């Protein structure tokens, strides 16, 4: 079709124009600006806790806002809320569907959400009126598996799905209020901005998109990764984010420069990244890997700072406490480890 | 710190109660075998059975089986297929008669190959159901369709000696069946290494012994794993 051909030609012209604009804005690289910065040295983190009790592999964990309670989701159909200080189990929620791939803890701490191959985000209220944790709401709009979910607050939650879309929900009515479309592959993860006005999402099209929560439109699209993006996380500042991909690299993208800042890669690393998270200051980038390890990266430089080498199977998830005290890693060996 | 001691005692009691529940949950989980029923929608998979995932529970010889088939999911499988790395077996259902109508059997062969060589599924055994034999029989007997059109290897292929054709079965039907089986077997034996195994079965969608075949294959898988742990195999 000539109309299709000319539309594709116009899209190619627009992509070229964007590329030259980004090149024009690239006066110098982040690597050659941070030369005079002193290196962070060697980061030697030790396993402080090991949470046991999950029968099968763990896909997701999420810290509470109090930096003490965390929820973990396991493929044996269990949600466990742990008291990381004392390793005690606070709750053990049996799941209707055993195939859970994500879990979110509400910032207020009154709710947890989980979802997976059932295409449903289930909301449980922890602050039980009677005493027992029950299903509060089931969100059943997605036509593909849920890969991530994050509470904006109570009564609002953003989910990413395998149907290549992200959605915004009203928990009271159980209805989608906004649908975010534009990804061509499965959306694997999403990260809320600190102000909760925007969120980035990484999909299986090797691209990341910046969305406006209020206005369902997509603001920016970031490319540079070669394979599926499994993990995404905002810089604590909010003007940048990091992505983990199957191409065995992590990359840092700047929102205002609208391009890649630098790549964290090593020759010895040939396995994909499953999870990424920044430290409290953003100077360190923590990435989980398929080779059972977590690598701590200097964010401003490209130097690998340290390694977390405790897990016996694939590292599926990791998260850093809000106060930056500790980092927790879930794994397919059914163990959560706390590191300091 | 009296209030601290009281709340710590309450937390310890709650943790003990949760672990007491988790013990019986573990007992239930270990006694159940989980199966991934994976195959094309035109392969007779639905008839074998009788939301993004459907569950059916059947008990064979007082042994619990939990079989999951794919529901509302996109055709891109490379991400959600990793959820089934620890299942007892993956039941693969293939339409044997669909060797001409799209090279459907070639697509099934490629899917099986990618399943076999995936790093996360390398320890998972596959129960293979070469379905629709009552259709492949009439397809071969009629002669209107040639397997050699889509698989040139069928010209030089000879029926294996270990073949055990059913009574009253045409030699051409048996040769076609065993050629289709040997394609999957050739894929399997390339990178087996003893870590996981394949159990081909000539199947019809209405066969009443399918649960028995699944039970026997799962029991063989469990026995092989246990013998591997003792380094006997």
């Amino acid at each position, epitope marked *: 079709q000539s109309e299709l051909d000319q539309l594709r030609q116009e899209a190619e012209q627009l992509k070229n124009q964007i590329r030259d604009a980004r090149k024009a804005c690239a006066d110098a690289t982040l690597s050659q600006i941070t030369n005079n910065i002193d290196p962070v040295g060697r980061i030697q983190m030790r396993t402080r806790r090991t949470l046991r009790g999950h029968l099968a592999k763990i896909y997701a964990m999420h810290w509470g806002t109090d930096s003490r309670l965390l929820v973990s989701a396991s493929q044996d159909g269990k949600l466990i809320i742990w008291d990381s200080y004392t390793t005690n189990k606070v709750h053990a929620i049996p799941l209707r569907s055993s195939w859970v791939m994500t879990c979110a803890y509400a910032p207020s701490g009154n709710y947890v959400a989980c979802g997976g191959l059932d295409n449903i985000c289930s909301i449980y209220n922890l602050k039980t009126r009677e005493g027992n944790v029950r299903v509060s709401r089931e969100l059943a709009g997605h036509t593909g598996y849920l890969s991530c979910c994050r509470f904006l607050d109570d009564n609002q939650i953003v989910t990413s799905s395998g149907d290549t879309t992200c959605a915004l929900w009203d928990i009271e009515t159980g209805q989608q209020t906004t649908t975010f479309t534009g990804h061509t592959g499965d959306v694997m993860s999403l990260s809320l901005a600190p102000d909760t006005r925007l969120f980035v999402s990484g999909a299986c099209d090797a691209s990341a998109k910046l969305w406006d929560v209020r206005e369902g439109m997509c603001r920016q699209t970031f490319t540079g990764h070669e394979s599926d993006i499994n993990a995404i996380c905002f810089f604590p500042n909010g003007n940048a984010f990091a992505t983990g991909s*199957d191409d065995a690299t992590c990359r840092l993208f700047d929102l205002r420069a609208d391009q890649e800042l630098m790549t964290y890669s090593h020759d010895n690393i040939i396995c994909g990244i499953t999870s990424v998270s920044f430290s409290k200051s953003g100077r360190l980038l923590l990435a989980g890997y398929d080779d059972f390890n977590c690598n701590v990266w200097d964010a401003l430089k490209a130097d690998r700072a340290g390694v977390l080498a405790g897990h016996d199977n694939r590292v599926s998830c990791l998260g850093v406490t809000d106060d930056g005290m500790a980092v927790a890693t879930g794994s397919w060996d059914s163990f959560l480890k706390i590191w300091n | 710190t009296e209030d601290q001691r009281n709340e710590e005692k309450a937390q310890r009691e709650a943790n003990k109660k949760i672990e007491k529940q988790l013990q019986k949950d573990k007992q239930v989980y270990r006694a159940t075998h989980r199966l991934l029923l994976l195959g094309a929608g035109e392969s007779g998979k639905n008839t074998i059975v009788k939301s993004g995932i459907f569950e059916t529970k059947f008990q064979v010889d007082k042994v619990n089986f939990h079989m999951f088939d794919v529901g509302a999911q996109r055709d891109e*499988r490379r991400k959600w*297929i990793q959820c089934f790395n620890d299942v007892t077996a993956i039941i693969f259902v293939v339409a044997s008669s669909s060797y001409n109508m799209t090279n459907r059997l070639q697509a099934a062969l490629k899917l099986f*190959d990618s399943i076999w060589n995936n790093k996360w599924l390398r320890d998972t055994s596959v129960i293979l159901f070469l379905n629709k034999q009552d259709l492949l029989a009439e397809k071969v007997l009629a002669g209107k369709s040639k397997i050699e059109d889509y698989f040139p290897e069928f010209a030089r292929y000879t029926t294996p000696e270990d073949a055990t054709p059913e009574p009253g079965e045409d030699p051409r039907v048996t040769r076609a069946k065993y050629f289709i089986r040997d394609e999957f077997l050739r894929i399997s034996t390339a990178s087996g290494d003893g870590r996981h195994y394949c159990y081909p079965h000539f199947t019809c969608s209405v066969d009443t012994e399918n649960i028995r075949r699944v039970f026997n294959d799962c029991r063989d898988i469990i026995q092989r794993m246990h013998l591997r742990q003792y380094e006997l195999l």
Partner: nanobody, 128 residues
Framework: QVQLQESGGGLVQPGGSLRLSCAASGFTFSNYKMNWVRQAPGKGLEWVSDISQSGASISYTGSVKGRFTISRDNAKNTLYLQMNSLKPEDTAVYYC?????????????????????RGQGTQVTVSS
């Protein structure tokens, strides 16, 4: 970004020869396994051929075996499909597909209806 251009497709007589080229950019070519897929008019996608990372392991679909040869040049980041004996049943849009992950033997979704890392495709018409 991951971008793939196919070229060389066009009208050809039955029994003729044609060559398909695939220019790749935005990723390390030598670390990935390449594929060729086609979409017949009004029918689904079918896998044709693939070549390993080094160019050693090559497999074809049965219908084209002995007729099509696949070739890759890691230095030039180019994938080829030389055609020898075309048939009217070979009339299809031919896509240059790439396996989703590097250093992997498996290759899942190259024939999906919506699959990234696949080019726009070039039309091959065989008629008289």
């Amino acid at each position: 970004q991951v971008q793939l251009q196919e070229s060389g497709g066009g009208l050809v007589q039955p029994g003729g020869s044609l060559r398909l080229s695939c220019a790749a950019s935005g990723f390390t070519f030598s670390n990935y396994k390449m594929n060729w897929v086609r979409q017949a008019p009004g029918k689904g996608l079918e896998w044709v051929s693939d070549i390993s990372q080094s160019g050693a392991s090559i497999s074809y679909t049965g219908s084209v075996k002995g007729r099509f040869t696949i070739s890759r040049d890691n230095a030039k980041n180019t994938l080829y499909l030389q055609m020898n004996s075309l048939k009217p049943e070979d009339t299809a849009v031919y896509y240059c597909a790439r396996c989703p992950a590097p250093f992997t033997r498996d290759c899942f979704d190259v024939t999906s209806t919506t699959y990234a890392y696949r080019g726009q495709g070039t039309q091959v018409t065989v008629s008289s």
